[PDB]
C-alpha cells in the first residue's frame, strides 16, 4: 500500500530508468547474476556467460533486461492495480521458469543497488523508500500467487 506521494516518487525514479531502459536492465541483470550466481542457472540462454565481461558484451542480456524492466515499468505504472499484468508473470515465473521468491528479492535489491550506482546522490532517501515499497508490493503480490500455486 503506497500513498499517492509514494507512487509519485516511484514514477519519478522510473523516469530515470526509462531514459536508458536497456542500460538499467543490463546492469540489473548483471548485478543479479554476479551477486547471486545461482540465478544465472535459471537462464538456459545466459548460463554460458562465465565472466562479467561476457555478460556486459551480451546483446541478448541487454535485450532481456529491456524485456524485464519494460514489464516491471508497466506494472509500476498501474500504481498497485496490476493484477492483470502481474498474474502471467507470477504464473510463468512459478510454473515455467521455477523462480523462487528469494530471487525476486535479489532482483529487487539489485534494482536499488543499480539506481544508486547509476544515479549516485540522485536517488534520495524518500525515493529509495518509495521504490522499495513498490518492489515489496510487487514481490508480495507475486508471493500470494506463488502460495496459491504451492510453489516454493
In angstroms, the CA 127 to CA 7 distance is 10
Q: How many CB atoms lie within 10 A of CB 56?
A: 13
Among residues 67, 56, 68, which one has the least CA distance to residue 31?
56
Q: Does 112 bind ligand HEM (CB under 6 A)?
A: no
Q: Is 116 assigned a ligand-binding role in the annotation? A: no
Q: Does 29 bind ligand HEM (CB under 6 A)?
A: no
In angstroms, the CA 29 to CA 17 distance is 14
- Binder of ligand HEM out of 17, 107, 114, 134 (CB under 6 A): 107
Q: Which residue is nearest to ligand HEM (CB)?
A: 92
Q: Is 93 assigned a ligand-binding role in the annotation? A: yes
Among residues 75, 100, 61, 63, which one has the least CA distance to residue 7?
75
- Binder of ligand HEM out of 11, 16, 23, 43 (CB under 6 A): 43
Q: Does 10 bind ligand HEM (CB under 6 A)?
A: no
Q: Can you list the alpha helix ranges (DSSP code H) found in the chain?
A: 4-19, 21-35, 37-40, 52-57, 59-76, 83-91, 101-118, 125-149
Q: Which stretch binds ligand HEM (CB under 6 A): 6-14, 51-59, 98-106, 116-124?
A: 98-106
Q: Which stretch binds ligand HEM (CB under 6 A): 5-13, 15-23, 48-56, 93-101?
A: 93-101
Q: Which stretch binds ligand HEM (CB under 6 A): 1-9, 11-19, 35-43, 118-126?
A: 35-43
Q: Which is nearer to ligand HEM, 5 or 35 (CB)?
A: 35
Cα end-to-end span (Å), the chain: 25
Query: Which residues would be at the binding site for ligand HEM (CB under 6 A)?
Result: 39, 42-45, 67-68, 71-72, 89, 92-93, 97, 99, 103-104, 107
Amino acid at each position: 500500500g503506497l500513498s499517492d506521494g509514494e507512487w509519485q516518487q516511484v514514477l519519478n525514479v522510473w523516469g530515470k530508468v526509462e531514459a536508458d531502459i536497456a542500460g538499467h536492465g543490463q546492469e540489473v541483470l548483471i548485478r543479479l547474476f554476479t551477486g547471486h550466481p545461482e540465478t544465472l542457472e535459471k537462464f538456459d540462454k545466459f548460463k554460458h556467460l562465465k565472466t562479467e565481461a561476457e555478460m556486459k558484451a551480451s546483446e541478448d542480456l541487454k535485450k532481456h533486461g529491456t524485456v524485464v524492466l519494460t514489464a516491471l515499468g508497466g506494472i509500476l505504472k498501474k500504481k498497485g492495480h496490476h493484477e492483470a499484468e502481474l498474474k502471467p508473470l507470477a504464473q510463468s515465473h512459478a510454473t515455467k521458469h521455477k523462480i523462487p521468491i528469494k530471487y525476486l528479492e535479489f532482483i529487487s535489491d539489485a534494482i536499488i543497488h543499480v539506481l544508486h550506482s547509476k544515479h549516485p546522490g540522485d536517488f534520495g532517501a524518500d525515493a529509495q523508500g518509495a521504490m522499495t515499497k513498490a518492489l515489496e508490493l510487487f514481490r508480495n503480490d507475486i508471493a500470494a500467487k506463488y502460495k496459491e500455486l504451492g510453489f516454493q
